[PDB]
């Protein structure tokens, strides 16, 4: 059991990006709502807290209770990762992004190729490509659901997750893809 999109949206929260966690070639907007992959020479202030191999950034807040919803503009991008993860995930590593390893994510691999990161991954039958994706976590019930906000349709739910300890949002704007995937992911208010 999982809500329709309007029900999920009633639990909207205010997510921001944690620029300190970020893979060092990522570039962040001032409001910490957008992240994109810069060229190989643009680097953030190095640190032992950053992702070193996976082009990933974590969001805030971390939480350990209730129902939480957020939405992300993906636009015409050709690759990205969105979802949630345990706050204890390892950052120095490349993590198979799986529930057992503490990740619940959906991934766009390329045009018309989307998967939920179960193991093995589950290909998603998306008819109308999403321009905005909604993520709904019900902590108590142990479910995380993904919505195609453009179509107003449910994409995928990880159920029986049995969450313990804090979870946080996770993002990747994907590889630059020869110029086709340079746009940022942008966290956006419901509307």
């Amino acid at each position: 059991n999982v809500p329709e999109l309007i029900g999920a949206q009633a639990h909207a929260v205010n997510v921001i990006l944690d620029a300190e966690t970020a893979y060092p070639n990522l570039i962040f907007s001032d409001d910490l709502k957008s992240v994109r992959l810069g060229n190989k020479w643009e680097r953030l202030p190095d640190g032992p807290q950053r992702f070193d191999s996976c082009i990933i950034v974590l969001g805030s807040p971390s939480f350990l209770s209730g129902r939480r919803y957020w939405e992300v503009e993906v636009g015409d991008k050709t690759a990205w990762i969105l979802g949630a993860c345990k706050t204890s995930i390892s950052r120095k590593g490349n993590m198979t992004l799986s529930p057992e390893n503490g990740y619940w994510v959906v991934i766009m691999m390329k045009e018309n190729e989307y998967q939920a990161s179960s193991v093995p991954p589950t290909r998603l039958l998306i008819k109308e490509p999403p321009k905005r994706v909604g993520i709904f976590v019900d902590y108590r019930v142990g479910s995380i659901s993904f919505y195609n906000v453009t179509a107003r349709s449910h994409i995928y739910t990880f159920a029986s997750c049995s969450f313990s300890g804090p979870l946080q949002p996770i993002f990747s704007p994907g590889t630059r893809d020869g110029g086709k995937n340079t746009a940022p992911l942008t966290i956006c208010p419901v509307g």
Side-chain angles (χ1 to χ4, degrees), residues 4 14 18 23 49 64 80 85 87 91 109-110 112 132 137 139 141 176:
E4 286 155 307
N14 183 26
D18 188 350
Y23 183 69
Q49 77 287 347
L64 57 146
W80 45 255
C85 64
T87 51
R91 302 190 193 170
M109 314 266 29
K110 64 166 43 65
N112 200 50
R132 186 180 276 226
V137 179
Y139 194 97
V141 170
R176 279 178 158 262

Side-chain angles (χ1 to χ4, degrees), residues 26 35-37 55 72-82 108-114 129-131 171-177 179-186:
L26 294 176
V35 57
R36 67 186 180 80
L37 183 53
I55 304 174
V72 182
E73 295 192 330
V74 299
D76 298 342
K77 289 179 63 53
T78 63
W80 45 255
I81 303 174
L82 294 172
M108 185 182 182
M109 314 266 29
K110 64 166 43 65
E111 307 99 296
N112 200 50
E113 182 175 332
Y114 301 87
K131 305 305 178 177
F171 310 83
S172 171
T175 298
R176 279 178 158 262
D177 184 17
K180 301 306 291 187
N181 197 39
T182 63
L185 295 173
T186 297

Side-chain angles (χ1 to χ4, degrees), residues 86-156:
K86 297 179 323 183
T87 51
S88 53
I89 60 161
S90 174
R91 302 190 193 170
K92 273 58 170 77
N94 226 300
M95 69 196 82
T96 181
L97 304 181
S98 70
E100 179 165 328
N101 293 160
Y103 297 88
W104 300 269
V105 299
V106 166
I107 302 178
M108 185 182 182
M109 314 266 29
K110 64 166 43 65
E111 307 99 296
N112 200 50
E113 182 175 332
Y114 301 87
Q115 64 181 220
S117 200
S118 54
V119 186
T122 300
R123 191 198 65 195
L124 302 167
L125 303 93
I126 286 180
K127 286 185 293 181
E128 311 187 348
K131 305 305 178 177
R132 186 180 276 226
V133 173
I135 304 92
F136 179 66
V137 179
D138 185 329
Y139 194 97
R140 197 176 47 66
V141 170
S143 66
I144 172 170
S145 298
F146 293 82
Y147 299 86
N148 180 159
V149 174
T150 306
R152 302 92 56 88
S153 62
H154 171 263
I155 295 173
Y156 188 82

Side-chain angles (χ1 to χ4, degrees), residues 11-19 28-35 57-63 67-73 82-84 133-137 167-171 185-190:
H11 297 98
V13 298
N14 183 26
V15 173
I16 58 162
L17 299 163
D18 188 350
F28 296 86
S29 61
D30 282 330
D31 64 6
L32 292 174
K33 294 286 178 173
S34 298
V35 57
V57 59
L58 303 172
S60 313
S62 305
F63 57 88
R67 284 173 282 166
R68 317 272 168 153
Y69 175 83
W70 63 99
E71 285 192 354
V72 182
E73 295 192 330
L82 294 172
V133 173
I135 304 92
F136 179 66
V137 179
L167 310 180
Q168 68 193 128
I170 185 172
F171 310 83
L185 295 173
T186 297
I187 296 159
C188 287
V190 174

